């Protein structure tokens, strides 16, 4: 039973009313293939805008969300308020969240299990820095991340998990098929031994960091790169080539 | 002349679009007295929402931003998409943003500055810690956390001054009116001495934590006072006697 194709395009804190609309055009007028599941992930303030002009082809994610339904958190939303404007994603453990804001394990875990309960999807981000992989050491930080994600996640229908090697992410320098191939082949033999067989057979495990039109139809032929995860190239017209990587 | 009153609500992380939409209709049903100035923050996913919604008597503000344009920060905004939602305020330096999310005074004077140069105004949090209250060094807090904030605004016209002190945010245990007043008179004595006398007798220092319609009217009757920044209190029609705590 086949994984069904995943592209997430993360707008970032990109674009405004004129310029996001625009591009929300181009996708309701481009035909998504058969057995493809496209997501956009917009700035918190433009979810709302964004579920109202996407055509329902097209869901919507949320960029971060905090950790209980409410509270006394001036600056942050939760997975309710996310649902309650239509979208039905939100994106944690984002490379900027871990490393820019700070934002731990513990904390990204606590998010997952909170959206999770509150019947949101999750697009879950792992991935390692430069130096951890010059030392060696890729696997064992991707494995550690996946697994506090894992001790927080009852029921994987509703979660993807993204692959983001942090050297690879905004700096044009995309992973090559077979680093990717590699990574995502460990991490679903992780899924296997820790979860389960079918758990590891169905989640879909997808690649960012600078997919670009040019890299994607490569990267989308390994048998265990599900999807991407796609940054720059999602504010371009780019990103309907991305979402027919597999034609 | 006079300064003109002003009360912030700070809905903080709570509500949905039913819930908010009643409040905003409670709002919009008010009378907003002569000379006071309103601002409901909602939560992010909803400025664009309480824009649309609420009377162009009440301006509406972003609970936080960051500190460039636009650029690879996942789950921020920037004052640009805030102007473009219709909203005319940002609330930096809350006790929550600092305290739970550890943004530091550097980073609180970078947001200050690209507000402002954005042409936002600003409502520029400052509090000590309940620790701090007790080891006696309040104003050496509030006056560094004032300076930083002070040494990125070139015009104070479109700024307004908060003191929240943490250990009344959220516990019920509002300053006296007293307490307030001395605070204040010190922040509006500093910014004499640090900026001009200009400065400081148009420059509107509001209060924070624990406002209630049972403490408003005293508290809004300080001379140094010059209104409120609400929490609990902004998600409840009581919003409406503190918004006329001075009739």
Chains 1, 2 share one sequence.
Not at 8 to 29: C, D, F, H, P, V
């Amino acid at each position: 039973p086949s994984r069904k194709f995943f592209v997430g395009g993360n707008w970032k804190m990109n674009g405004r009313k004129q310029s996001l609309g625009e591009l929300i055009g181009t996708l309701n007028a481009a035909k998504v293939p058969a057995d493809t599941e496209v997501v956009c992930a917009p700035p918190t303030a433009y979810i709302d805008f964004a579920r109202q002009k996407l055509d329902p082809k097209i869901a919507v994610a949320a960029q971060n969300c905090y950790k209980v339904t409410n509270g006394a958190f001036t600056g942050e939303i939760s997975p309710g308020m996310i649902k309650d404007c239509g979208a039905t994603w939100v994106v944690l453990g984002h490379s900027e969240r871990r490393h820019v804001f700070g934002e731990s394990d513990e904390l990204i875990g606590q998010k997952v299990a909170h959206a999770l309960a509150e019947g949101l999807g999750v697009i879950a981000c792992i991935g390692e820095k430069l130096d951890e992989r010059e030392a060696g050491i890729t696997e064992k930080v991707v494995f550690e991340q996946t697994k506090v994600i894992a001790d927080n996640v009852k029921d994987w229908s509703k979660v993807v998990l993204a692959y983001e090697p942090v050297w690879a992410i905004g700096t044009g320098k995309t992973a090559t098929p077979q680093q990717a191939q590699e990574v995502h082949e460990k991490l679903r033999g992780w899924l296997k031994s820790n979860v389960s067989d079918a758990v590891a057979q169905s989640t879909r495990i997808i690649y960012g960091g600078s997919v670009t039109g040019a890299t994607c139809k490569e990267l989308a032929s390994q048998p265990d790169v599900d999807g991407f995860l796609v940054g720059g190239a999602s504010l371009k017209p780019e990103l309907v080539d991305i979402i027919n990587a597999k034609q």
